[PDB]
Design a protein around this nucleic acid. Structure first.
Lengths: 150, 103, 56, 17, 110, 142, 117
RNA sequence: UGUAACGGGGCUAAACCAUGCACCGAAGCUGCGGCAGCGACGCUUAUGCGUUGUUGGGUAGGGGAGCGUUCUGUAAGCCUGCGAAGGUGUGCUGUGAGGCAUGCUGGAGGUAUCAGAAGUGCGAAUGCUGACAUAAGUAACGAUAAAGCGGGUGAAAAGCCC
RNA sequence: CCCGGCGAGGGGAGUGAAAAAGAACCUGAAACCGUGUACGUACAAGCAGUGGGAGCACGCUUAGGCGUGUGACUGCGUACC
């Protein structure tokens, strides 16, 4: 804290409490007894534990029929309107599209759709699977999952 | 025209057709209850209990309410000994109206 | 020389009970001009006992 | 509100020895 | 009617003015006016001016016939205080409070 | 239900006459305190003055056993540098015979506003005559 | 994540001051003094929940003793007679009967006297 | 300092000794209602118990279980200008910290449930800052070189001008 | 527009959804200081409360009490850290 180490007043004779510095934490305008510092909150998770949780999550999605497997999922042109129509007739509004190969055409179509996400099998995280109401996996996307999950 | 009877460990003097509050009883709110433990019955003529609980005296009473009493705050504090404690209590009670007093 | 405990507002008011002012409630009316004035005092315009005394 | 910049220096009238 | 009238930020202390206020509380305006005229206090002329204003407000903005008016309510409230530094002996300093007050007078015909 | 409490307005107080001739001071005084407190009534209430008015006659004829007639001493302080004054039983009787009986009752009653109130019921006279015949003061033998 | 305690602190102080309502002076206005007053009232309330039972017991005995003596028997004798006669009426009813029903009490003392004799 | 060596009144039994029968007397014991811990058994088996016995004063200290506040996800969901937060009363509710509904002011934000992280709870430290009391309408108004009157101006003159 | 000292301050009028939003200006808590109403208090001794409790003033159904406020009198009771 900006200031000086000079004692505000003498140790004895003054009728008020002993003080040592203007920057003491019990003083106005300067203090904070335990000041925070920039810290890393990331924690270690074992590889097997990460895989086990991912396997556990996928199984339960299948059990709650929240996971739908279909053939290749693609859009002819990079238009959000087309993607909205394709998801409308399927009665899906909050979906996570997982495809084996990432194509810019599908990536751009879903960019402006908040409730819709497009992802690759490699870039799969537990939070996304849990958060999204429905998960749609392509045939290719499914295959890569077992290979990486093993 | 009043009688004395023992209900919940404490005796009550109740006249005909009056409501008396007494400890909780295992009786539903819409059923009559019997008090055959009549300590004393008083009228124009006086009858006492040569043996406790008269001979055939009974009291007919109907349950009305099964509420809880006013909240009581219990405070325990030890001076200078760094010990304070708080508690609350609401005593269960049963309201019953006397319907009939026998002889 | 100095207090050991601060007196309450009750004691403060009790001490102040004798500080109330009193109204004159004794305003006399001049014989001639009929102007209210303090007894045994000249009026504002300069009258006393009827006859003008200031002439100013 | 403001600490008196000057603190008077007292004396020991009563040695109390 | 209400016909209130107040004078805010009077320099006089609330305590000192409050003695004058108690004199005329509940009295008719005619008796209140000459009571203040012959009261030897600075607060007397402050309160009298407020009372004159209240009567004028009633006469102009409200019904006439100010003869039957009474001072139903009158109270003095402490106002903002000005802090001043006054040197004392041995280099010490002390705070002088210039206390103000709000004088409120309410007159009505009923 | 709630225990009965006497209401001061609806209290009946009787008048009695006690002859204090040839009666032990303390034993007479003890009885008077009981009547003045109202403890003899079934509606007695500690915080209500349920007692009865008592007239005591022939105060100067009270009797004391033993040498108390000469050894009993009444001390009172005047609140001054050395103002401690003592009077024997004879001196009190000669000066004010009624005061000794009042002093005895005073100490046999509770201290406080209610205690003073019930003490005011007692009316001690030195002679055999009283001017309270308008109160129908029935004779009390005790 | 700085936390301001203005709202919570004001709630706690209001709760104590509400419980201190009716006390004299700073005991009903100032929290530091009100808290002590409220705590002391709590101790007294706990203590007097037990003194009340004995205080009323003393009052009933005094009432019975006055009524019994008026009938010509001491309290201790009267209670002993009831125990001998196998009467389970407690002091609360006995005092209540004496105040209201004089005839009923007269029967009780008569019953007690018979049992003693 | 004042009786002042029964707590007092007062007592010749209301003192002392011996015997006896009564009664008063605690938060002790019993009766009635309610809560919680621990060990068993008849049975429920992540929990009630038709049950059973017992325990529940407590500082230093150890163990267990919870309330509330700010922020993150759930949450572009939900409540909200026919009224959010905050403020101020009232009425219910839980063994507790608390919670719920609502009157008036307020004027646009708040946040269920379940998890996550803490600048997470103040009555004291001759604590720090601001505000406001007390003494108190009291002391004081700063050289004991000294003022008085007339007129003028002014809303007002012992202090200004003549 | 009016009171006032061609003041300060205020009461009307008008602006505005709102002027107890008037620049001393969002919300406006506490200490502290006031006016009004109900009850209590000038023969009574002490941590100012607690238990019991009459009377009085307000409201409620019933006509007896229930609530709210106050609280004479009385038992016990020497703050916190």
């Amino acid at each position: 804290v900006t200031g000086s180490g000079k004692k505000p007043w003498r140790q004895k004779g003054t009728g008020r409490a002993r003080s040592g510095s203007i920057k003491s934490p019990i003083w106005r305008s300067g203090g904070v007894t335990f000041a925070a510092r920039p810290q890393d909150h990331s924690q270690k998770v074992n590889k097997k534990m990460y895989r086990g949780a991912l396997k556990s999550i996928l199984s339960e999605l299948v059990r709650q029929d929240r996971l739908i497997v279909v053939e290749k999922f693609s859009v002819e042109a990079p238009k959000t309107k087309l993607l909205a129509q394709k998801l409308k007739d399927m009665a899906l509004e909050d979906v996570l599209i997982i495809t084996g190969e990432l194509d810019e055409n599908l990536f751009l179509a879903a960019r402006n759709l908040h409730k819709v996400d497009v992802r690759d099998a490699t870039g799969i995280d537990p939070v996304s699977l849990i958060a999204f109401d429905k998960v749609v996996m392509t045939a290719d996307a499914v295959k890569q999952v077992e290979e990486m999950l093993a | 025209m009043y009688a004395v009877f023992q209900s919940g460990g404490k005796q009550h003097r109740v006249s005909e057709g009056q409501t008396v509050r007494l400890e909780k009883l295992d009786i539903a709110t819409g059923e009559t209850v019997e008090f055959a433990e009549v300590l004393m019955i008083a009228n124009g003529e006086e009858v006492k209990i040569g043996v406790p609980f008269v001979d055939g005296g009974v009291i007919k009473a109907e349950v009305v309410a099964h509420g809880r009493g006013e909240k009581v705050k219990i405070v325990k504090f030890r001076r200078r000994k760094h010990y304070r404690k708080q508690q609350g209590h609401r005593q269960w009670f049963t309201d019953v109206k006397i319907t009939g007093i026998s002889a | 020389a100095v207090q050991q405990n601060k007196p309450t507002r009750s004691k403060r008011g009790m001490r102040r009970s004798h500080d109330a002012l009193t109204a004159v409630t004794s305003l006399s009316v001049d014989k001639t001009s009929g102007e209210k004035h303090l007894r045994h005092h000249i009026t504002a315009d300069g009258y006393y006992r009827g006859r003008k005394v200031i002439a100013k | 509100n403001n600490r008196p910049v000057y603190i008077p220096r007292p004396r020991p009238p009563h040695p109390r020895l | 009617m209400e016909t209130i009238a107040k004078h805010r930020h009077a320099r006089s202390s609330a305590q000192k003015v409050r003695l004058v206020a108690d004199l005329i509380r509940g009295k008719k305006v005619s008796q209140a006016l000459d009571i203040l005229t012959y009261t030897n206090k600075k607060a007397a002329v402050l309160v009298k001016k407020v009372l004159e204003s209240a009567i004028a407000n009633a006469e102009h903005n409200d019904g006439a016939d100010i003869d039957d008016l009474k001072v139903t309510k009158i109270f003095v409230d402490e106002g903002p205080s000005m802090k001043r530094i006054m040197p004392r002996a041995k280099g010490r300093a002390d705070r002088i409070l210039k206390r103000t007050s709000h004088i409120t007078v309410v007159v009505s015909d009923r | 239900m709630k225990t009965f409490t006497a209401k001061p307005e609806t209290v009946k107080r009787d008048w009695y006459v006690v002859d204090a001739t040839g009666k032990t001071l303390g034993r007479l005084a003890t009885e008077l305190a009981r009547r003045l407190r109202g403890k003899h009534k079934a509606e007695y209430t500690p915080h209500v003055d349920t007692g009865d008015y008592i007239i005591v006659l022939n105060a100067d004829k009270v009797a004391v056993t033993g040498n108390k007639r000469t050894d009993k001493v009444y001390y009172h302080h005047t609140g001054h540098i050395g103002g401690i004054k003592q009077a024997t039983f004879e001196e009190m009787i000669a000066r004010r015979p009624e005061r000794v009986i009042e002093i005895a009752v005073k100490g046999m009653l509770p201290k406080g506003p209610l205690g003073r109130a019930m003490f005011r019921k007692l009316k001690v006279y030195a002679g055999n005559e009283h001017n309270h015949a308008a109160q129908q003061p029935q004779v009390l033998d005790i | 994540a700085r936390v301001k305690r203005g709202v919570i602190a004001r709630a706690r102080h209001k709760k104590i001051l509400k419980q201190a309502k009716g006390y004299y002076g700073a005991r009903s206005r100032v929290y530091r003094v009100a808290f002590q007053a409220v705590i002391k009232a709590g101790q007294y309330a706990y203590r007097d929940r037990r003194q009340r039972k004995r205080q009323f017991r003393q009052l009933w005995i005094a009432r019975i003793n006055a009524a019994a003596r008026q009938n010509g028997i001491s309290y201790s004798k009267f209670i002993n007679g009831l125990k001998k006669a196998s009467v389970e009426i407690d002091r609360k009813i006995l005092a209540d009967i004496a105040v209201f029903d004089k005839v009923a009490f007269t029967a009780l003392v008569e019953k007690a006297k018979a049992a003693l004799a």
